[PDB]
Design an enzyme around this catalytic site. Sequence first.
Site, short mmCIF file in Angstrom:
data_model
loop_
_atom_site.label_atom_id
_atom_site.label_comp_id
_atom_site.label_asym_id
_atom_site.label_seq_id
_atom_site.Cartn_x
_atom_site.Cartn_y
_atom_site.Cartn_z
N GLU A 53 0.83 -1.20 0.00
CA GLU A 53 0.00 0.00 0.00
C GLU A 53 0.87 1.25 0.00
O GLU A 53 1.77 1.40 0.83
CB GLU A 53 -0.95 0.02 1.20
CG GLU A 53 -2.21 -0.81 1.01
CD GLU A 53 -3.09 -0.84 2.24
OE1 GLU A 53 -2.54 -0.87 3.37
OE2 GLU A 53 -4.32 -0.84 2.08
N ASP A 197 -8.65 7.51 -23.39
CA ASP A 197 -8.66 6.11 -22.98
C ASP A 197 -8.13 5.25 -24.14
O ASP A 197 -8.90 4.70 -24.92
CB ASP A 197 -10.08 5.70 -22.59
CG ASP A 197 -10.17 4.28 -22.06
OD1 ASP A 197 -9.18 3.52 -22.14
OD2 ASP A 197 -11.26 3.92 -21.56
N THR A 223 -5.58 -0.04 -20.82
CA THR A 223 -5.40 -1.39 -20.33
C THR A 223 -4.05 -1.88 -20.82
O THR A 223 -3.51 -1.37 -21.80
CB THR A 223 -6.51 -2.34 -20.83
OG1 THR A 223 -6.52 -2.37 -22.26
CG2 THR A 223 -7.87 -1.90 -20.32
N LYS A 226 -4.49 -5.50 -24.07
CA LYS A 226 -5.00 -5.50 -25.44
C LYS A 226 -3.85 -5.55 -26.47
O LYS A 226 -3.13 -6.55 -26.53
CB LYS A 226 -5.96 -4.33 -25.68
CG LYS A 226 -7.27 -4.46 -24.90
CD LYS A 226 -8.18 -3.26 -25.11
CE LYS A 226 -9.51 -3.42 -24.39
NZ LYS A 226 -9.36 -3.47 -22.91
#
Lengths: 405, 405
Positions: A53, A197, A223, A226
Site C-alpha cells: 500500500e 482512454d 489497459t 490489449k
Amino acid sequence: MKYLPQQDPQVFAAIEQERKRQHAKIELIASENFVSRAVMEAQGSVLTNKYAEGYPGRRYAGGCEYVDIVEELARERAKQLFGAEHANVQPHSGAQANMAVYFTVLEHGDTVLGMNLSHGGHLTHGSPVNFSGVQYNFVAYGVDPETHVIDYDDVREKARLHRPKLIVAAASAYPRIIDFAKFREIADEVGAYLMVDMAHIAGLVAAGLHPNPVPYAHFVTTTTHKTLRGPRGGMILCQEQFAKQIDKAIFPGIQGGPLMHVIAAKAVAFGEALQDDFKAYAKRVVDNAKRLASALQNEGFTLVSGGTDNHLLLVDLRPQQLTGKTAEKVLDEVGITVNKNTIPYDPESPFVTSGIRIGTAAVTTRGFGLEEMDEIAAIIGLVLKNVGSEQALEEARQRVAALTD
Amino acid sequence: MKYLPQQDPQVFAAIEQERKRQHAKIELIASENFVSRAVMEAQGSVLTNKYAEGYPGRRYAGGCEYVDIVEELARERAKQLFGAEHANVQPHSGAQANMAVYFTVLEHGDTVLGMNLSHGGHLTHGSPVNFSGVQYNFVAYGVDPETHVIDYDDVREKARLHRPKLIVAAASAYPRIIDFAKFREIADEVGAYLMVDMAHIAGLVAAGLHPNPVPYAHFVTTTTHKTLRGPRGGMILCQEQFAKQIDKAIFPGIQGGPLMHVIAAKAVAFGEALQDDFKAYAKRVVDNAKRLASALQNEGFTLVSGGTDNHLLLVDLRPQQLTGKTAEKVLDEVGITVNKNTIPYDPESPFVTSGIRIGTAAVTTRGFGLEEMDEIAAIIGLVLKNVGSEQALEEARQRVAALTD
C-alpha cells in the site's frame, strides 16, 4: 504445471481445456491477445504475498524494498514507451484506471463529454448502468452516419452547449485514427480537461503507428492486456502537475493494496514493447487488419467506416440481413471467435446488434500473416452467406482446423 | 522459472530478491500470508488471455465455456465454505468488493455507520480521503477506552441518531470476536442493511473458529489473500434476493472484464480451505496468536483489549515511551516485519502511532508453533527495551536468522 494437477484436478482440467481451446480456435476478439511465457511467470510469482500500500519509497508497510524496484521498472519503462512525465501502474483494470481519473478531477454530478456507446464508445464512458453514467452527467458526441468517422464539429457543439468539466476520447469499437489535436483544441475552447482512454490502441501508439495522445491529453488511461500484449490490468499516464493527485486517487482513493505480481508482469510487458520486434509485430497487426478488411469487402461485406486504420474492424451485416448475435453464434460453431457489436445508428438493441467486431492482434501474435487473413475472410464468407447449410459449416470447420495447425 | 530469466533479467532479479526476503524475514503483517504453489500456478496460467465480461453462462463474449466452469467452481466452493446462498468471485480487491456493495444499496450522500478508523476500522469504512467517506456520509462507532472491545451501546446510539441506510461491521486491527448477532439486532431496529467485511477473519470463519456473519448479514465482503490464504482479490457473499443486484454492481457497475486466472486461483484456495488440514492450520494460527500475546505480556508489553481472540494483536507501546513508527523501524533492522498501527484513542497521528499490529497467519503457514512464538516475543522484548544498543540488535539479528533456518 506441477503442483496444481495434484492439488486441484478439477481446476487444472478446465485450464488445460482453455489452453487447448486458445490454440484450436481462431481468436478474433479485438480486445484479446496472447501473453508471453515470461509475463505469465511474473504473474505466478511470490509477489502476491506482499502488501505494498502506497508507492515506491513512500510505502505504508516495511519490506517493500524489492517490490519498489519492480514498480519503478514498470513506471519508468512506461514513461520511456509513451513519453509521459508520470505513470501509475497500480490500476487493477482499465475500468479502475478511468475511475481514478474521474475521481481526481470531477465532483459527483459533473458534466462529462464522451463518445456515444452505440457509435464505438466504452461502457465506462457514460453507460447509465455503469458507475460513470450514474456518478457523473455524461453527454455523448457521435460519428457521421455515412462515413462513421467522429464528427468533430459535433464534439465541438456538444462541448460548447453542455460545458463539460472533462472530455473523454477513444473507443472500444472505432476502426479509425482519433485526432487528439482536435480534441485538445475543443477542450481548450470550453476550458475542460482532456482524457484519452487508449486501451485498444495502446500497443499501436507504443510502436508509433497511431498518433500519441500523451502530448495532447491531460490524462491518458489504458489497459495493459490489449494491443500492448501484457497482463490483465490498467495504467494511468499524466503530466507531473497531476501526478500527486492521480496517485492519491488510486490510493487511498479507490483502491487498496496493489497487485505486485501483475505489476511485475506489466514491467515485463513494457520491456517486451520497447524491443524492436514488437514494433515489427504491431505493424503486422495493422497490415493484417487492412488485409482482412480488404478481403471481407472482396467477399461482399460492408464495413463500418469503409475499412480500418488500426487493429480492429466492424462488419455491417445489414446487407446480408443478419444480426450480430446470429453471426456470433454460427461462427462459434465453426471455431471462429468474434463478438456481436452495435454499429453506428444501429436499428437493433445492444443485445442483438447488426454487426460483429473483429481484431487481428491475437492471430498476429500466433504468426498469422496476409495469406491467413485472406483465408479467414474466405471462411467468414462461406459461413455467413450459407448459414442454413451444414455442409458449408463442416467445410468451414475443417478450414479453420487447417489454419490452426 | 525458465522464460523470465532470459527475457527480463532486471525483473527476475528483483523477484528472486523478494523470494529470498520472504524466506529470510519474520513476516508478522496481519494481512499477509504465503500462498501454495498450486495457487501461484493458476495465477500464471493462460486464463489472463480471456475476456469474460458477464457471468458463467450469461457472458457477453463467446468461447467462455471453460472459464465458466472455473468461476462456477470458485462460486460453489465459497458457498460450500461459508454457507452462503450466493457468491461473487469477480472483485479485483476487497476495496472493490466493498465498493460494489455500497454501489448496490446506497445513493450518493447516504448515511453509513462503520467502525472508527483509529479504533480498528478499515480505510474503506469511511476515510475522508477514500471513496467511501467522499461518496457517502460516514459516521463512526467506537470501542471502550479501557477494554478496547466494541461498545455495542454506542453502535446502537449512533444508529438511532444518524439513521444510517447501511451498517458496516468488521475491522483491519480488531483483536477480538465481533458479535454479528448484536449488529443485526441494531440494524433491524433502525431499518438498515448489515454489511460485514470479514477480510481479516475469513479463514478463521471458514474453519469455524470465528462466528459466521453469513446468517446475520445481508452482505458479506472479504479479501481472499489474508487468513483465507488465497490470491490477491475480493469476494462478495449475499442471500439470493440481492444476488442479481450484487452481480449488476460488479458488472456492468464498477468493473469490466474479470481476472479469470486469479478467479482460478481463488477456486484452488477455496478447495484447499475445504480440506481438513486448513482447519488444523487455522486453529494453530489462533493458538499461535494467543501464545504470542501471552508471551509479549510476559515480556512486559501492554496489549490492546488485553490479548486476542483471533489471528492478530495490537501492542500498546506507550508504557515503553515508543511510537509505532520507531518500533516498526528498529524491528525492520533486525529482520522482523511489522506495521505501525493506531491504537484506540491514540494521542499520535496515523503516520506516527503508538502501536504495532502483529499477525500469526504468515509464520504459521511456514511451520511456526508455540515454541517459536515464545522466541519471537523474546526478540521483540530484546529489541524494544534496548533500542539504543547495537549489540542487542545484532543479538536479535542472529536469533531471527536462527528461526528462519
